[PDB]
Design a protein around this ligand. Structure first.
Ligand SMILES: [Zn+2]
Ligand SMILES: [Zn+2]
Lengths: 83, 1102, 67, 48
């Protein structure tokens, strides 16, 4: 259990398909639990579509924690992970 | 116009079916049973005796079914349709005459009843025998019903034809890797059925028997069977052949390797291993046990001091094993139709009755003993009361065996199921093809396709196309159109005739010359050698043709194995063939003229030797001509009609020889599911399920079989105007385009009729159910659930019943005074109508209620249609008539068949059918698509051109949506279409939450029980391969069975209510969600004492 | 069962032709084709409606339950 | 492993039979007779 500093991160700087699906699901679950949103809904009422809009604007406030097989991890905010 | 025999010889087929129908296997077998086998069973168990009172013998002198000698006329039977309505067995009493002695030296007869025999429909004993459709109407029976099945408890049960290996015949079968050669004979005598193997082990031939404890050296057995010279053993199993003698010398030497032997010594060696006989007659364990050891070794009963027959049988079997050892491919093929025998309903019922009669007689003897076992007051008066009360066991056993299909025969000691099946009433052809069905023997090692393969030897014996899909494929076979199943003929006069014809008996000949001439066999048993075997065979066939020997006796000469075989047993499949003599066919059209005139029926063609039955083995020697135009002098027989190779069901297909064969098999499956007309009394019937087409049409292109089997009288389908073109894009991958307003006018319309049966049963506390009801609300208005009920509490006839409404108001006593409600609710997605309510009583006195619910169905998207060529497909779109393309006359298709279904399926018969039907409607005539024949395509083209249409059936059409001429000519005309029973209305199912299993807490498994759709291991694999973990959790745990268990963190054992109940703390109890299946698994493991302790850890804390 | 009122395809009324077609076949016996053309059934769909119809109602009426 | 109780090798010998919860072996209502019917495991343990 040790956090690898943001300076030296070995994993991909690209959001994987699994990370995107999980981020959307988690953010949509949060929104369905009445979490505040950071985009203009424009008539949207569905949490998954709201979360897709937030991902398109890179405004989802979540962090990906990528555990290496040795036990260490590194944190990638959703904004910095490039899609 | 003079008869042309090259085309009028097919009339032998209608003449044949006029006297030997499609359901004749069943009818003949049941007639033979009730006419000879009952007498044979009675004679076998003629007397039943008791140990005490030798001045007492109870005799069985005569038996009969359905008729007393008090009245000349037969007994009154309840009509079969009345039995169908009241849920009774259609049965006749079993009358016997009894000689039971009185005490004061009195001998007398009687006519007593010992039960009821279920009567096969249209048998000798059936009331429907010889009724002329006016008696049929009065009896509420369809004249086109096949018969051949039973009605037990109101259910139509057919005893399916069973196919088994020939009994009492040797099958040689080699092997690879193992390198054994095994010859086995199944000796099925009347009292015993045993298998006598002749194995090969370490290069040495052995004998293996179930009774014998050890496999015996073969030379020991040949010595035990009187063949001790040890040189003739070589002359019996090898003859003069350097190879065979070399192979067998090892066993010859192993005879002495133990010791030198005499006959009695070998008998003692045999007898030292005969296991036991349940410790009875124990004083016989000596050399005197070999006798029953050897007379149990096969089906050849030796009852004297001669072992010639059995010794030569064993020697021939050993020779077969040796020939297989030297030259493989000299083994028998287990899937050859000559090696198969078909056992029938009569033989089945005979075995069943004999066993039930033995049990009846045992119990009756014991009851007699109990009655006469008193010191005083032992008057003989009325010894028959115990027969008046024990007679119900015969009736019960027969009914139970036919009803369940389970046959518990103790004498032969086998428990077989599936003997009887419910008569499928999906369609007229469905019932007909249910008859003529043959189920293959079990334990076939279904992993392989050996028996599943279609055999060339089934040509004209079993239908080449009528085999099911799914698991059963070749395991279920159907009789071909013109066949016959032989009957057991006595082998004694035939053996005498063989001796007369030049066969020197098997006891006059020496071993050296045994394999120098052909040996004559009789049911597989060698009965002598013959000089000039071909002349012997020819004289035997002349005797059969002139009527001196029975016509079902087959003779054939095998040339590799130098033998002349004569078969007399039943269960052989055979078909009539026209005899060809001197290069000429013997029918020559004068007999055809007489046949068409009315005299000279088919059996006269046998009584004059113009036709004869050939079984499969005789065809091994014949040389059959398909047509008279290709007879050569070397030929022996002529086909009566080559399309008879297809059965009844495959005879619906028009032009089946222009289709790829899987399409013909698919049509055999689909035609049985076609919705149409069931019977002329189909509205008097009250059946569990019945699909009826409103406006059945007979096909425009029929075949000879269709009119032979009367499918043109109860057709299942309609002649759809079909345009074969790509259209709208909803007709891709077999989907159909249906014309709205063809549907509006009644195309494809059908109704469902369903039956619900209730019994107002009676109870031990002098109580019974009631149908009280039809309660109202304050106004006096019936409540909604009783809206269509009527005063009696049984839904009114004619009224609509919706989902939730009651149509039988059944109240059950709360103490079976007070009546708990058990109403019969209609639970249907769509409303039904009540068209029949039948009130009646069953045989056991109690009221029976049947309510028939009818549901008119209109074709919709997803309804299934088929065109007799295996081109099924659902309705994919229903379009308005104006959107359909139209021709110059404004004709629009009722259906649009996509053209992409043709190039890969290669059903050219469907195109030929379209053209034939089109020319047929234009000309005013129904056309023919008979196999290997039918209406010629060029003649149909001539009709089309003469009527103004293109010869190829391609009309120029206008688009319905644009009005422009389509740039391609469209294949356009009538095609016969069947609406299949599979309607999306009965398939649509959706479950959100509903019943769960009490054990697993998982959604039920039944579409009727609102069950959920299983997510199996392969779907689980797919979801894992997607890497959808949360979806895995949601589908498997959360939305199937999520259980909030309490888990102790000290002991990994589930508690309850936050209570460890092993630590008794409530301190370490964690709350978590696991599948209830997992909770169940843990509680089951704890049962076996296994403790699957769960170790937990915080999800967080990193 | 009983003859359809309308041709399934064109919608032409063919239900008034069944008895007259039967009469043309039985009395003053003609071919089926000529009998069909004499009734005005020119389109082959209309000809089919009469030529292929099976009159099962006459058989079903032999089992009259209210005799 | 003999650190914990039941790690003894004598526990693998049937000396006490645990009777499973009736939920594991449920009794089905209204089967055949009006009298309630039981199931196989329960019948077997009654014999035991
Ligand atoms: Zn605990
Ligand atoms: Zn028309």
């Amino acid at each position: 259990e040790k956090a690898i500093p943001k300076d030296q991160r070995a994993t991909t700087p690209y959001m994987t398909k699994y990370e995107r699906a999980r981020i959307l699901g988690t953010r949509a679950l949060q929104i369905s639990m009445n979490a505040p949103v950071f985009v203009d809904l424009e008539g949207e009422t569905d949490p998954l579509r709201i979360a897709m809009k937030e991902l398109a604007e890179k405004k989802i406030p979540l962090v990906i924690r990528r555990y290496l097989p040795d036990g260490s991890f590194e944190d990638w905010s959703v904004e910095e992970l490039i899609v | 116009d003079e008869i042309n025999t090259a085309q009028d010889k097919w009339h032998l087929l209608p003449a044949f079916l006029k006297v030997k129908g499609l359901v004749k296997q069943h009818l003949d077998s049941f007639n033979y049973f009730v006419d000879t086998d009952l007498k044979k069973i009675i004679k076998a168990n003629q007397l039943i005796l008791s140990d005490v009172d030798p001045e007492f013998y109870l005799k069985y002198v005569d038996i009969r079914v359905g008729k007393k000698s008090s009245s000349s006329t037969k007994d009154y039977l309840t009509p079969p349709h009345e039995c169908r309505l009241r849920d009774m067995t259609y049965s006749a009493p079993i009358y016997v005459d009894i000689e039971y002695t009185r005490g004061r030296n009195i001998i007398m007869h009687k006519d007593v009843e010992i039960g009821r025999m279920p009567i096969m429909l249209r048998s000798n004993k059936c009331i429907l025998y010889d009724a002329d459709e006016s008696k049929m109407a009065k009896l509420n029976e369809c004249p086109l019903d096949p018969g051949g099945y039973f009605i037990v408890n109101g259910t139509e049960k057919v005893i399916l034809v069973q196919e088994q290996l020939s009994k009492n015949r040797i099958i040689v079968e080699a092997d690879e890797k193992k390198g054994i050669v095994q010859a086995s004979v199944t000796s099925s005598t009347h009292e015993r059925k045993s298998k006598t193997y002749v194995i090969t082990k370490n290069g040495k031939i052995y004998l293996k028997h179930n009774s014998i404890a050890e496999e015996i050296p073969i030379a020991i057995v040949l010595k035990a069977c009187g063949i001790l010279s040890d040189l003739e053993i070589m002359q019996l199993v090898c003859g003069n052949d350097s190879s065979y003698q070399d192979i067998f010398a090892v066993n010859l030497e192993e005879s002495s390797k133990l010791d030198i032997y005499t006959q009695q010594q070998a008998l003692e060696y045999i007898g030292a291993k005969v296991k036991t006989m349940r410790r009875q007659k124990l004083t016989i364990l000596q050399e005197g046990i070999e006798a029953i050891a050897t007379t149990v070794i096969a089906h050849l009963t030796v009852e004297a001091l001669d072992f010639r027959e059995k010794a030569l049988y064993i020697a021939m079997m050993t020779r077969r094993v040796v020939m297989a050892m030297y030259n493989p491919k000299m083994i028998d093929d287990r899937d050859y139709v000559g090696n198969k025998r078909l056992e029938l309903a009569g033989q089945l019922i005979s075995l069943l009755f004999e066993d039930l009669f033995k049990k009846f007689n045992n119990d009756f003897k014991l009851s007699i003993d109990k009655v006469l076992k008193k010191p005083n007051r032992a008057m003989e008066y009325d010894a028959l009361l115990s027969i008046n009360v024990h007679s119900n066991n015969i009736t019960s056993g027969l009914n139970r065996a036919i009803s369940t299909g389970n046959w518990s025969l103790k004498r032969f000691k086998m428990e077989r199921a599936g003997v009887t099946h419910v008569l499928s009433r999906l369609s007229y052809i469905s019932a007909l093809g249910m008859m003529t069905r043959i189920s293959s023997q079990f334990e076939k090692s279904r992993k392989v396709s050996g028996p599943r393969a279609l055999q060339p030897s089934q040509f004209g014996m079993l239908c080449t196309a009528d085999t099911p899909e799914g698991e059963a494929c070749g395991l279920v076979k159907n009789l071909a159109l013109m066949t016959h199943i032989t009957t057991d003929d006595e082998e004694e006069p035939i053996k005498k005739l063989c001796y007369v014809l030049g066969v020197e008996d098997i006891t006059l000949i020496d071993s050296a010359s045994l394999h120098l001439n052909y040996g004559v066999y009789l049911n597989g048993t060698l009965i002598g050698s013959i000089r000039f075997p071909t002349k012997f065979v020819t004289q035997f066939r002349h005797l059969r043709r002139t009527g001196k020997v029975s016509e079902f006796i087959s003779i054939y000469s095998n040339s590799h194995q130098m033998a002349v075989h004569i078969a007399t047993d039943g269960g052989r499949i055979c078909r009539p063939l026209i005899i060809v003599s001197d290069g000429q066919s013997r029918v020559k059209d004068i007999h055809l003229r007489k046949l068409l005139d009315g005299e000279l029926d088919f059996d006269d063609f046998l009584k004059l030797g113009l036709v004869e039955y050939l079984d499969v083995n005789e065809e091994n020697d014949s040389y059959i001509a398909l047509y008279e135009k290709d007879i050569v002098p070397s030929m022996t027989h002529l086909e009566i009609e080559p399309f008879t190779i297809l059965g009844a069901v495959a005879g619906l297909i028009p032009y089946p020889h222009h289709n790829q064969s899987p399409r013909n098999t698919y049509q055999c499956a689909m035609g049985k599911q076609a919705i149409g007309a069931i019977a002329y009394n189909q509205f008097k019937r009250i059946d569990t399920l019945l699909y009826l087409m409103t406006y059945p049409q007979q096909p425009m292109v029929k075949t000879k079989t269709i009119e032979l089997i009367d499918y043109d009288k109860l057709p299942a389908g309609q002649n759809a105007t079909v345009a074969v073109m790509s259209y709208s894009g909803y007709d891709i991958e077999d989907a159909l385009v249906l014309n709205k307003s063809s549907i509006d006018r009644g195309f494809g319309r059908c109704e469902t009729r369903r039956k619900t049966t209730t019994v107002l049963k009676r109870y031990a506390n002098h109580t019974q159910d009631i149908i009280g009801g039809m309660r109202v609300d304050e106004n006096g208005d019936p409540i909604w659930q009783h809206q269509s009920l009527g005063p009696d509490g049984l839904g009114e006839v004619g009224m609509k019943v919706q989902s939730g409404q009651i149509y039988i108001n059944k109240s059950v006593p709360t103490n079976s005074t007070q009546y708990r409600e058990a109403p019969v609710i209609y639970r249907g997605p769509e409303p039904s109508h009540i068209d029949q309510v039948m009130m009646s009583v069953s045989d056991n006195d109690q009221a029976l209620i049947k309510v028939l619910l009818r549901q008119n169905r209109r074709p919709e998207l997803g309804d299934k249609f088929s065109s007799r060529h295996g081109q099924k497909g659902v309705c994919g779109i229903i379009v308005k008539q104006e959107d359909m393309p139209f021709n110059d006359q404004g004709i629009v298709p009722d259906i649009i068949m996509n053209p992409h279904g043709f190039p890969s399926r290669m059903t050219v018969g469907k195109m030929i059918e379209l053209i034939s039907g089109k020319a047929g409607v234009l000309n005013g005539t129904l056309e023919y698509g008979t196999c290997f024949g039918g209406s010629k395509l060029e003649d149909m083209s001539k009709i089309l051109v003469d009527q103004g249409f293109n010869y190829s059936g391609k009309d120029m059409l206008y688009s319905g949506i644009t009005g422009e001429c389509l740039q391609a000519y469209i294949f356009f005309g009538p095609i016969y279409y069947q609406k299949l029973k599979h309607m999306v209305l009965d398939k649509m199912h959706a479950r959100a939450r509903g019943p769960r299993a009490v054990l697993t807490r998982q959604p039920t498994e039944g579409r009727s029980r609102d069950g959920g759709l299983r997510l199996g291991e392969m779907e689980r694999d797919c979801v894992i391969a997607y890497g959808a973990s949360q979806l895995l959790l949601e589908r498997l745990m959360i939305s199937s069975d999520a259980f909030e268990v309490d888990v102790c963190d000290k002991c990994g054992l589930m508690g309850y209510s936050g209570w460890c109940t092993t630590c008794k703390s409530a301190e370490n109890i964690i709350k978590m969600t696991i599948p209830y299946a997992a909770k169940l698994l843990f509680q089951e493991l704890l049962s076996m004492n296994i403790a699957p302790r769960l170790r937990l850890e915080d999800i967080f804390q990193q | 069962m009983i003859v359809p009122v309308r041709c399934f395809s064109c919608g032409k009324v063919v239900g008034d032709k069944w008895e007259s077609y039967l009469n043309l076949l039985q009395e003053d016996e003609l071919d089926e084709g000529t009998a069909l053309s004499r009734l005005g059934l020119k389109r082959y769909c209309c000809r089919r409606m009469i030529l292929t119809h099976v009159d099962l109602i006459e058989k079903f009426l032999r089992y009259n339950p209210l005799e | 492993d003999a650190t914990v109780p039941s790690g003894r090798p004598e526990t693998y010998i049937w000396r006490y039979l645990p009777a499973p919860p009736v939920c594991i072996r449920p009794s089905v209502m209204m089967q055949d007779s009006p009298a309630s019917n039981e199931d196989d495991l329960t019948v077997k343990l009654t014999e035991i």
